[PDB]
Amino acid sequence: GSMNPPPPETSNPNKPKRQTNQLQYLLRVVLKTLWKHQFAWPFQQPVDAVKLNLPDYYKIIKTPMDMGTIKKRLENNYYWNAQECIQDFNTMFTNCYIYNKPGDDIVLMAEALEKLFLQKINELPTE
Numbered sequence: 001g002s003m004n005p006p007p008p009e010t011s012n013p014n015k016p017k018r019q020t021n022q023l024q025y026l027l028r029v030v031l032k033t034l035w036k037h038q039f040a041w042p043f044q045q046p047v048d049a050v051k052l053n054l055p056d057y058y059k060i061i062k063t064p065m066d067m068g069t070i071k072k073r074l075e076n077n078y079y080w081n082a083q084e085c086i087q088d089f090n091t092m093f094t095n096c097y098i099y100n101k102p103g104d105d106i107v108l109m110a111e112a113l114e115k116l117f118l119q120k121i122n123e124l125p126t127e
């Protein structure tokens with residue numbers, strides 16, 4: 001079985017970064033709400049394809065993303081803008097929908113979290 005890839009970076013000294021009120025909202029409200037949700041745990045860390053015995057995961061998913069990575073990127077001030085962070089959440093959900101089958105429990109958990117995510121993003125503050 002294949003090894004896991006290196007996880008997505010959560011810091012980079014050469015990548016410019018900043019604080020915006022929208023990024024602060026993403027950490028304090030959006031990530032907090034999803035992180036603490038009962039369906040969060042499959043998404044709280046990179047997929048461990050070795051432990052989960054999913055030898056095809058990283059053959060199929062070439063742009064992995066997870067909320068552990070997002071949480072660290074927010075905490076570490078990795079992002080320049082909110083759109084980068086929203087793209088990471090979209091990538092996470094999309095990967096789940098591509099890899100898994102439409103009836104699977106993981107897909108129903110992703111759908112519930114995505115509905116909550118889209119509600120909280122519609123409330124993003126100006127700036």
Ligand SMILES: CN1CC[C@H](C(=O)NC2CCCCC2)C[C@H](Cn2cc3c(=O)n(C)cc(-c4ccn(C)n4)c3n2)C1
Nearest residue numbers: 041042043047052054095096099100101104105106107
């Ligand atoms: C053949 N099967 C069918 C459906 C299975 C399914 O729906 N399992 C869920 C897992 C969550 C709890 C309820 C049951 C999933 C299999 C593989 N799989 C895909 C995954 C996925 O995309 N992510 C993001 C995370 C996990 C995962 C599972 C456990 N952790 C820590 N992370 C994961 N596992 C594939």
